[PDB]
């Protein structure tokens, strides 16, 4: 292996062990469009990749070449496909390839190809033993990397590794209670384990969320989670909720609290509530305050809500 960054790196056209092969230049046609003026290093590696792809040469040197083509452009999915062909055809040790993908993902975590490649290797080896820990290290650098969370969900689901994830969720929530990815992971773990029907679980969750809301009134994630686990069976199914939210309104107020209250008024006005002319006006006044003072960025949305609430509850 001769690193693409090594001081003694040599273009492939100047390499003896490649003299037999004629590189294949890229054909962009007579009048190119969106033509990229590649560096000599790039064009050199890819002219030989094209040669090895055309001739479908499944050799150790071709395998080493894909590594350089990948490094020059990790987004080239065609190269990644040929590399997987070589892995099978050459019978390459897959853990060695696992160490390789571990390194490249650390380098470029926001790439679709690198994660899919890791998935294929895990699928091939039927071995998720390193996954949770590896993903955890990536998440320790970017706690919100979409691919990382997606890969974590896939591993946990396929190999049934649920036992310790909620603990992990609590760990990251303590580090940043505003991490929407962690709240999503929380709902992921719970809905695929115990579910939200067990009253002991639903209550536990609502209390935790309300408590987090008390700690950080303006954290939209806790509010969205609370709404998400209750709008299922309908907010009006829980009477104590309304007053309990109105209780922390003098101090822990936020445009989120106002909005939630409105979400309760509309469910009530939809499930035959008492004074269905008294609750309606409470809501319209809130839609008013929201659209006019407390949350004007969404004035068009709130004005729509008011008009829709009258359109069927007048």
């Amino acid at each position: 292996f001769l690193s693409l960054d090594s001081p003694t790196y040599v273009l492939y056209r100047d390499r003896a062990e490649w003299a037999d092969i004629d590189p294949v230049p890229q054909n962009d046609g007579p009048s190119p469009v969106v033509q990229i003026i590649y560096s000599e290093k790039f064009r050199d590696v890819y002219d030989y990749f094209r040669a090895v792809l055309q001739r479908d040469e499944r050799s150790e040197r071709a395998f080493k070449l894909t590594r350089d083509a990948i490094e020059l452009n990790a987004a080239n999915y065609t190269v990644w496909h040929f590399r997987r062909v070589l892995l099978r055809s050459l019978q390459k040790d897959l853990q060695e390839e696992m160490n390789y993908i571990t390194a490249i993902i650390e380098e470029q975590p926001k790439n679709y190809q690198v994660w899919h490649h890791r998935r294929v290797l895990v699928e091939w080896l039927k071995d998720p033993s390193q996954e949770l820990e590896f993903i955890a290290d990536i998440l320790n650098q970017d706690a919100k990397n979409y691919h990382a969370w997606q890969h974590r969900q896939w591993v946990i689901q396929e190999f049934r590794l649920w036992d310790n994830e909620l603990q992990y969720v609590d760990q990251l929530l303590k580090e940043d209670v505003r991490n929407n990815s962690v709240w999503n992971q929380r709902h992921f773990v719970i809905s695929n384990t115990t579910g939200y029907s067990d009253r002991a679980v639903l209550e536990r969750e609502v209390q935790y969320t309300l408590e987090m809301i008390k700690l950080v009134p303006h954290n939209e994630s806790a509010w969205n989670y609370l709404k998400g686990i209750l709008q299922d069976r309908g907010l009006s199914r829980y009477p104590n909720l309304l007053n309990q939210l109105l209780d922390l309104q003098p101090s822990h107020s936020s445009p989120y609290l106002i909005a939630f209250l409105v979400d309760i008024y509309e469910d009530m006005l939809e499930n035959q509530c008492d004074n269905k002319e008294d609750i309606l006006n409470k809501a319209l006044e809130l839609c008013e305050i929201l659209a006019k003072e407390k949350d004007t960025i969404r004035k068009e949305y709130w004005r729509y809500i008011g008009r829709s609430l009258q359109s069927k509850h007048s």
Binding site: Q26, N27, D28, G29, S31, P32, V33, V34, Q35, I36, I37, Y38, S39, F42, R50, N73, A75, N76, Y77, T78, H81, Y112, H116, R119, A143, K144, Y146, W149, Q150, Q153, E175, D176, V177, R178, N179, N180, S181, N184, H187, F188, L215, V216, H218, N219, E220, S221, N224, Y225, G228, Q231, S254, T296, I297, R298, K299, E300, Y301, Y304, R307, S308
Partner: protein
């Protein structure tokens, strides 16, 4: 004053971290301080603010990129049809004609990009992939000539789509590749425009997409994942193409997207508790015209007759004051480097925000100088509405392959 984000009341929209700091709040505060500087720059320099879309500067940027790019674009060597689409759409939005010689050149380049298997690759000889296939088809349609339409091998395209179809209703992005809601949209987009939709091609797709909607109201890449504007756009748009928008809880979705607009910045974020980004001016805001059309089809009587359900003015102020690179091209947020992807979507979003349309009604809101008005864009395909109708009618002149 005339500008929403410069008014004194707006200062109240700054982030309140409740005295509990975390990576999220700190990072959201950094961007807000940076955006405020831009907003206050006019008062600071003692000048009257004027919002001008640097049409000329962006044009040069685009016109040049369409032909040649530096080695800085090596990372997009597997995304060239994308470059063709982003640039041509930008020029289209800026209402700049495409020389017949350039059009034919684009057509010939995408021909080389087309695979013998069907679909298009990210460049000559590259395996077909659904993202560049969507890009190629959209570009060819923007051109809209008989030549461009004929580049597409409809029979092979269908075959390719079928090779990616999974039993659960989803599609692979490419052979031996990954799956997420993007593939559903790319497949539905190209299959509908070219009229190759067979009775069973999208069987189960609508259901698989509906499974991607989560507790947040938005849509994730795959079932179980966090709600994200890019994926939510793909999901809904795909459903509108398949006529199954109904499969979604549209009310929870509407509430989620509207909450994605930043009260202070004016632009949108891609997901809850993350940073604002100019490209989401299309991915997120573009969902309002889709929901407006979906709700109206259900006979929703509360829908406005002149505005989309998001602050059109604020999104325009964000884009115009914070997303233009003085050298030409648009971007994520101030401090970031320009690129054609962000140029394409920042302009697409500006278009959405200044053009309302619901049947017989038409209402515009063009912030800043009048010359800022752009050509309208179709909310499903993100190409001109005329190009959609033109391409659609054209391919309807031929039967669905067998």
């Amino acid at each position: 004053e005339p500008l929403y984000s410069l008014r004194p009341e707006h200062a109240r929209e700054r982030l309140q971290d409740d005295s509990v700091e975390t990576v999220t709040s700190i990072e959201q505060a950094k961007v807000e301080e940076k955006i405020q500087e831009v907003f206050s720059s006019y008062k600071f320099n003692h000048l009257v603010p004027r919002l001008v879309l640097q049409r000329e500067k962006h044009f040069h940027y685009l016109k040049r990129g369409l032909r040649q790019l530096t080695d800085a674009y090596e990372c997009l060597d597997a995304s060239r049809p994308w470059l063709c689409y982003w640039i041509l759409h930008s020029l289209e939005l800026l209402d700049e004609p495409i020389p017949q010689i350039v059009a034919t050149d684009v057509c010939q380049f995408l021909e080389l990009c087309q695979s013998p298997d069907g679909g298009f690759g990210g460049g000559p000889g590259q395996y077909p992939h659904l993202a560049p296939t969507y890009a190629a088809v959209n570009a060819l349609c923007i051109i809209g000539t008989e030549e461009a339409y004929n580049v597409i091998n409809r029979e092979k395209l269908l075959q390719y789509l079928y090779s990616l179809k999974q039993p659960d209703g989803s599609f692979l992005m490419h052979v031996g590749g990954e799956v997420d809601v993007r593939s559903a949209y790319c497949a539905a987009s190209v299959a509908s425009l070219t009229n190759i939709i067979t009775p069973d091609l999208f069987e189960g797709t609508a259901e698989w997409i509906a499974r991607c909607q989560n507790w947040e109201g938005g849509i994730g890449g795959v079932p179980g994942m966090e709600a994200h504007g890019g994926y939510t756009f793909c999901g809904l748009a795909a459903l509108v193409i398949l006529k199954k928008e109904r499969s979604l809880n549209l009310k929870s979705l509407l509430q989620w997207v509207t909450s994605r607009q930043m009260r202070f910045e004016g632009g949108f974020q891609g997901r809850c508790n993350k940073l604002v980004d100019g490209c989401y001016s299309f991915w997120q805001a573009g969902l309002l015209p889709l929901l407006h059309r979906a709700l109206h089809a259900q006979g929703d009587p509360a829908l406005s007759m002149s505005h989309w359900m998001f602050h059109q003015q604020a999104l325009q102020e964000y884009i115009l004051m914070c997303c233009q690179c003085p050298a030409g091209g648009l971007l994520d947020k101030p401090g970031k480097s320009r690129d054609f992807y962000h140029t394409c979507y920042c302009l697409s979003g500006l278009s959405i925000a200044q053009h309302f349309g619901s049947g017989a009604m038409l209402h515009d809101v063009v912030m800043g100088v009048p010359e800022n008005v752009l050509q309208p864009t179709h909310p499903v395909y993100n190409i001109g509405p005329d190009k959609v109708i033109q391409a659609t009618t054209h391919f309807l002149q031929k039967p669905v392959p067998g």
